[PDB]
């Protein structure tokens, strides 16, 4: 769903799709080729 | 010819922000000159074919 975001101060607009790639357990978020945020895990939950 | 492209200033300059587009009106009419230049590139590359 095309919604707004608020993930510990990180804001954006997009939809939610599950990530098939592996992730670090101590990682908060990752970056794309253009160095903006692309995959944010739930603090309260945890699904990358 | 070449691969035709077009750049919109709403998404390239501003990364999903409403207040960035409000301060874009203070810079005037810069982006309609670049839109007309990218259109006339695309007409001339269609004229080359």
Swiss-Prot record, chain B:
Disulfide bonds join 9-31, 14-20. It comes from the Viruses. Precursor of the fusion protein processed in the biosynthesis of the S protein and the formation of virus particle. Mediates fusion of the virion and cellular membranes by functioning as a class I viral fusion protein. Contains two viral fusion peptides that are unmasked after cleavage. The S2/S2' cleavage occurs during virus entry at the cell membrane by host TMPRSS2 or during endocytosis by host CSTL. This is Spike protein S2. It comes from Severe acute respiratory syndrome coronavirus 2. The lineage of its organism: Viruses, Riboviria, Orthornavirae, Pisuviricota, Pisoniviricetes. The chain holds residues 730 to 778 of 1273 of the full protein.
